[PDB]
From Swiss-Prot, chain A:
LRR repeats lie at residues 113-135. Responsible for the cleavages located at the N-terminus of the replicase polyprotein. Participates together with nsp4 in the assembly of virally-induced cytoplasmic double-membrane vesicles necessary for viral replication. Antagonizes innate immune induction of type I interferon by blocking the phosphorylation, dimerization and subsequent nuclear translocation of host IRF3. Also prevents host NF-kappa-B signaling. In addition, PL-PRO possesses a deubiquitinating/deISGylating activity and processes both 'Lys-48'- and 'Lys-63'-linked polyubiquitin chains from cellular substrates. It comes from Severe acute respiratory syndrome coronavirus 2 (2019-nCoV). Changing C107S: Complete loss of PL-pro activity. The lineage of its organism: Viruses, Riboviria, Orthornavirae, Pisuviricota, Pisoniviricetes. This is Papain-like protease nsp3. May form homohexamers. Interacts with N protein. The active site is at C107 (for pl-pro activity), H268 (for pl-pro activity), D282 (for pl-pro activity). It catalyses: Thiol-dependent hydrolysis of ester, thioester, amide, peptide and isopeptide bonds formed by the C-terminal Gly of ubiquitin (a 76-residue protein attached to proteins as an intracellular targeting signal). It comes from the Viruses. The chain holds residues 1568 to 1876 of 7096 of the full protein. It is a multi-pass membrane protein. Changing G252S: In strain: Omicron/EG.5.1. A zinc finger (C4-type) spans 185-222. Residues 67-309 form the Peptidase C16 domain. Changing V62A: Partial loss of ISG15 cleavage in vitro.
């Protein structure tokens, strides 16, 4: 029979497979839209379908690198294994954003996706561009499976939003992003630091962007207490993170935020978005309020250019 | 050289390190002194996350510097 093999679902390679032998005997590990077909023999119904295989020659290796920007040998098996589950999730539109109904501990992925849909970000790998476009259109199975694969997280595993965003930012073009900080010690003087890319958009220790602009107290190695403050920011967003703590979200002062209810061992994420009012998205669920107080872990802010006075 | 690590509970730990030590070895020493597994540890310096492959010298960590130890979330 005639079948097609692929690594990118764009460039197809015609193969003739013997229906008396398994796919595994002919191609190595083989997937049909996420389903493991290694141990299955070709069915009549398979004729003309596209199958994913592993990158087992130089041509496929090049195609895979150009599409995914990874050479992890296990990346495609992990992607397919994720997709086999994520294709069965539901992706309702909630307040105009693609969310994910609860399944398989996917609250962190739902929050990540909701956040991504509210900040200006361009992916570098074609795979992420394409899947994100479809996910925004409401078909997010491929996007979520790619997120899982890139982050080396299996379906069902407890996830952290901050870590996931860090990983995703690694695969985004944020190089132009720049952050200049100053640390002032009354004994030692002033020290500027410049950060580029991911380190320019992420901070762990306070949720408040305003406080970071005004100054946070940190130890100096001389033993005094120095003040660290933000001198300059060039980025389309910033992410301020801290261990989950009760925090009031005020309409109009932030883009979106993550809420974590639970503990270090066990917990749940919700998403808060600042629109005409504050909306709390919990998978398929949506509520609204004029104010917000809860255990916030991550806050996202709009940015373009900031220079300290 | 010595460094300090401030925990979520506010406890300050003292570690004997070298600038050539990787972050993985720092997490190993933290596990030796506290039991917190290296998989759960996330080390922060002046608000930036430190990655396991790089060394203390790569992040410009001098003597008596203070890191913060936070934990990964399980959402
Ligand atoms: Zn000083």
């Amino acid at each position: 029979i005639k079948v097609f093999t692929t690594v990118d679902n764009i460039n197809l390679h015609t193969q003739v497979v013997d229906m008396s032998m398994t796919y595994g005997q002919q191609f190595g590990p083989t997937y049909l839209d996420g389903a493991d077909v290694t141990k299955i023999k070709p069915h009549n119904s398979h004729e003309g379908k596209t199958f994913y295989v592993l990158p087992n020659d130089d041509t496929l290796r090049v195609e895979a690198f150009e599409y995914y920007h990874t050479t992890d040998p296990s990346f495609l098996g992990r992607y397919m294994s994720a997709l086999n589950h994520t294709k069965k999730w539901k992706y309702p539109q909630v307040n105009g954003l693609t969310s994910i109904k609860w399944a398989d501990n996917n609250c962190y992925l739902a929050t990540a996706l909701l956040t991504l849909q509210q900040i200006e970000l361009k992916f570098n790998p074609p795979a992420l561009q394409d899947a994100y476009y479809r996910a925004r259109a409401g078909e997010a199975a491929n996007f979520c499976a790619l997120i899982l694969a890139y982050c080396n997280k299996t379906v069902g595993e407890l996830g952290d939003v901050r870590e996931t965003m860090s990983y995703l930012f690694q695969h985004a073009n944020l190089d132009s992003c720049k952050r200049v900080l100053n640390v002032v010690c009354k004994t030692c003087g002033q020290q500027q630091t410049t950060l580029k890319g991911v380190e320019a958009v992420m901070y762990m220790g306070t949720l408040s962007y305003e406080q970071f602009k005004k100054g946070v107290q940190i130890p100096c190695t001389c033993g005094k207490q120095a003040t660290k403050y933000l001198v300059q920011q060039e980025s389309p967003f910033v992410m301020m993170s801290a261990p989950p703590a009760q925090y009031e979200l005020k309409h109009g002062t932030f883009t979106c935020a993550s809420e974590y209810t639970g503990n270090y061992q066990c917990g749940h994420y919700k998403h808060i978005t600042s629109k005409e009012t504050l909306y709390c998205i919990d998978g398929a669920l949506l509520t609204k309020s004029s104010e917000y107080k809860g255990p916030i872990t991550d806050v996202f802010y709009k940015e373009n250019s900031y220079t300290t006075t | 050289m010595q460094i300090f690590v401030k925990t979520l509970t506010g406890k300050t730990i003292t570690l004997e390190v070298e600038p050539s030590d990787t972050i993985e070895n720092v997490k190993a020493k933290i596990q030796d002194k506290e039991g917190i597994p290296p998989d759960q540890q996330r080390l922060i310096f002046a608000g930036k996350q430190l990655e396991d492959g790089r060394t203390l010298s790569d992040y410009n960590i001098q003597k008596e510097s203070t890191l913060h130890l936070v934990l990964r979330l399980r959402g």
